[PDB]
């Protein structure tokens, strides 16, 4: 390269073998992606099948105990372990794999391997985009859920007391984590989460509306009732009428796209911005910087007991979550909370 | 020959020359909606407090009564009315009509008619522009969601007070109480809906990144790439073969969309069918079908209860249930 | 390269981008005003 | 906070709005 002889070496041989067409492309990123992602997925599937949670959370979280696909999870370590990395050679496991599975080290294994697998996969998109000479907008978009994974599974438990309050890898455990932020943080009320919700809903709207608009503004190209066979990949003509689409959406919605590149850039921009804002909100929640209450409304409700709002209803509901959650959610607190102090409404 | 008044009015209504197409669906869409917006702005600004639970405990909900934008909400109808129809003429005074939540019913009815006729008008403009008409079929999913959360759930629970409050904090209250009642997180239809919106964001990012990444070089680096696209052109603006090859060597070769028509159909069909499923999940929860119940499922050989993540979700449901409508329950079983 | 700067560029922002900017600022203000006012 | 938030909201709704208006008019007056 660059009018130089460039004497061939083992690095060039390795690059030539790694950048070759096959079923699954490897590249250099495959030296990290394939083991990291394979071990993360296999560790999650092994924890959801055999590895229990009886000592970390006092819970059943695997198929071998009777849990199904929804209720099984790779559980987070105990809060007394703090933010320990829980290596199998660490001071906690000390070489014992069987006790390492019971100590919750599988969560740290799966989480770290999944984070490195995300790094490797986005490096894989970078390397493939450089191989075929395309811009890496794919991994510019894939920067968003890596940031989300980092902020949720790493930054939030790092800011809190320990990996115990990290999300356990599983369906119902994620639901518990979600209801935990409802009750303890009022994560719905957070404006960064509000922007994240807006971004995801707008991205779903954009995907549905773009697919419907393209498929309903198609050209004939027919002599056949099935339009899917009316397409040729090797051509340089548009198959859906952008002019007709713009006219339809201008006369229905008021505004319409006139630039395909700007349309697709917007379809990229909305979910990435929403997910990044949600990541910033979870980083805020990592330090318990919650948008939990409106102080002026709180003083008004305290000094005037006839002032009820849905926000005050949400505050009471979150108090109910914390009270009826803490005793069986945080076993390290040993909260043997009696019945008479638990908040409870009229009858029910 | 088009001289008579009705022929002229019909040609003006069906005219595609207007800035916004009206149509025979628009002749219902426009006045019903503008009614709904007018009363919604007025109620959100200066709505007096509404006794939502029927227990003579009113909820302000409006900005002039001490609400901000997040906390401001048009409060649902009084529980005493239930599913009865409450227009202004069925009330003796505007004061009690506002106290009993009549604006909520008026907005909900006008909004349902407006979205239905908006879907009809979308079909009508697709017809008058020579287009394929299934844009309204795609739009049938948010319409289904709105109908499920504004009419179908009040029908199933027997009271319009049970619908989604017209706001943000009211929306969160609806979701929290709804989780308490039905355990929506543990429902397959809601799970498909969540997978649909997550995949919709994923596929929007995928398609946008693939097309914006594969645009043909027609400009320089000191001008915006959008300036490379000229509206009304017939020449393609991106390399479909390069994008498909990139996706094929990225994920899978034989499991990739080499046809743009099939790709765009998939983009259209996935979030739409998933939102259909989650709207039907809400509507089935309206008749109290509920999500998966796994409370005390894992039991040991001695019969002691082994708690799970579903049991922690049960604890959350208990915390919401004992707190929702804290004075409206004179009895234990929450059958209403 | 000469006495005038060779990297003289013109900044562009069309009316649609103006629409997007105005909507972004106003919607961000509407969302965050309840929290700034507290 | 009852009026400092008002001042912050005012500055936020004007300064980038004014900046965007500068750029928009700078483009609109040029053909």
């Amino acid at each position: 390269i660059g009018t130089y002889q460039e004497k061939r070496t083992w690095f060039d041989d390795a690059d030539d073998w790694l950048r070759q067409d096959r079923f699954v492309f490897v590249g250099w990123s495959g030296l990290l992606l394939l083991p990291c992602a394979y071990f993360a997925v296999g560790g999650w599937l092994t924890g959801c099948t055999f590895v229990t949670s009886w000592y970390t959370h006092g819970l059943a979280s695997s198929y071998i105990e009777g849990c199904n696909f929804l209720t099984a999870a790779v559980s987070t370590p105990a809060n007394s372990l703090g933010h320990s990395l829980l290596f199998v050679w660490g001071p906690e496991a000390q070489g014992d794999l069987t006790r390492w599975f019971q100590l919750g080290g599988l969560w740290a294994f799966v989480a770290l391997h999944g984070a490195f697998g995300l790094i490797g996969f986005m490096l894989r998109q970078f390397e493939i985009a450089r191989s075929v000479n395309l811009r890496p907008y794919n991994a510019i978009a894939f920067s968003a859920p890596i940031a989300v994974f980092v902020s949720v599974f790493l930054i939030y438990p790092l800011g809190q007391s320990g990996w115990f309050f990290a999300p356990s890898f599983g369906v119902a455990s994620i639901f518990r984590f979600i209801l935990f932020f409802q009750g303890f943080h009022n994560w719905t009320l957070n404006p960064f989460h509000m922007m994240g919700v807006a971004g995801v809903l707008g991205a779903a709207l954009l995907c549905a509306i773009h697919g419907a608009t393209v498929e309903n503004t198609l050209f004939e190209d027919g002599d056949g009732a099935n339009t899917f066979r009316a397409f040729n990949p090797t051509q340089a003509e548009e198959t859906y009428s952008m002019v007709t689409a713009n006219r339809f959406w201008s006369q229905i919605f008021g505004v319409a796209f006139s630039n395909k590149r700007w349309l697709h850039f917007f379809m990229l921009f909305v979910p990435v911005t929403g997910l990044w804002m949600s990541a910033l909100g979870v980083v805020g929640l990592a330090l318990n910087l919650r948008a939990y209450d409106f102080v002026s409304q709180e003083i008004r409700a305290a000094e005037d007991p006839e002032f009820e709002t849905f926000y005050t209803k949400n505050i009471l509901l979150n108090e109910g979550i914390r009270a009826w959650m803490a005793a069986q959610d945080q076993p390290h607190e040993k909260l043997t909370l009696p019945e008479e102090v638990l908040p409870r409404g009229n009858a029910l | 020959e088009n001289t008579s008044l009705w022929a002229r009015f019909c040609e003006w209504i069906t005219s595609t020359e207007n800035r916004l197409y009206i149509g025979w669906f628009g002749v219902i869409m426009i006045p019903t909606l503008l009614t709904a917006i007018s009363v919604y702005i007025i109620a959100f600004i200066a709505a007096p407090p509404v006794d939502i639970d029927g227990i003579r405990e009113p909820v302000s909900g409006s900005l002039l009564y001490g609400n901000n934008i997040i906390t401001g909400a048009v409060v649902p109808t009084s529980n005493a009315i239930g599913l009865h129809f409450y227009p202004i003429w069925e009330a003796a005074s505007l004061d009690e009509w506002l106290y009993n939540g009549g604006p909520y019913q008026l907005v909900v009815c006008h909004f349902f008619l407006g979205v239905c006729c908006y879907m009809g008008r979308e079909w009508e403009l697709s017809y008058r522009l020579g287009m394929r008409p299934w844009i309204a079929v795609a739009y049938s999913a948010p319409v289904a969601a709105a109908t499920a959360v504004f009419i179908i759930y009040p029908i199933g629970q027997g009271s319009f007070s049970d619908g989604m409050p017209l706001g943000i904090s009211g929306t969160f209250n609806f979701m929290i109480v709804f989780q308490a009642e039905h355990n929506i997180l543990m429902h397959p239809f809601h799970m498909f809906g969540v997978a649909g919106v997550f995949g919709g964001s994923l596929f929007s990012a995928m398609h946008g990144s693939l097309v914006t990444s594969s645009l043909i070089r027609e400009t320089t680096e000191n001008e915006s790439a959008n300036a490379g696209y000229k509206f009304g052109q017939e020449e393609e603006t991106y390399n479909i073969v390069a994008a498909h090859g990139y996706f094929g060597r990225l994920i899978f070769q034989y499991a990739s969309f080499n046809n743009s028509r099939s790709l765009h159909f998939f983009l259209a069909v996935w979030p739409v069918v998933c939102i259909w499923l989650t709207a039907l999940g809400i509507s089935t929860m309206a008749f109290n079908l509920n999500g998966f119940n796994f409370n005390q499922s894992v039991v040991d050989s001695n019969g002691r209860v082994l708690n799970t993540w579903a049991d922690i979700i049960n604890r959350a449901n208990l915390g919401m249930e004992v707190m929702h409508e804290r004075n409206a329950h004179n009895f234990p079983l929450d059958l209403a | 390269m000469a006495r005038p700067n060779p990297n003289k560029q013109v900044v562009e922002l069309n009316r649609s981008s103006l629409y997007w900017g105005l909507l972004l600022i106003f919607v961000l203000a509407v969302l965050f005003s309840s929290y700034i006012f507290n | 906070v009852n009026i400092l938030g008002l001042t912050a909201t005012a500055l936020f709704i004007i300064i980038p709005t004014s900046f965007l208006l500068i750029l928009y008019v700078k483009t609109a007056a040029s053909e």
Partner: peptide
Amino acid sequence: MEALVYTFLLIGTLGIIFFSIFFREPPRIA
């Protein structure tokens, strides 16, 4: 005093929506 700020922000938002709908740049079709 907060309510007037809220109502002003929302009427400005509806003004921007009406402005973007009815006084947009026409497509050039060239």
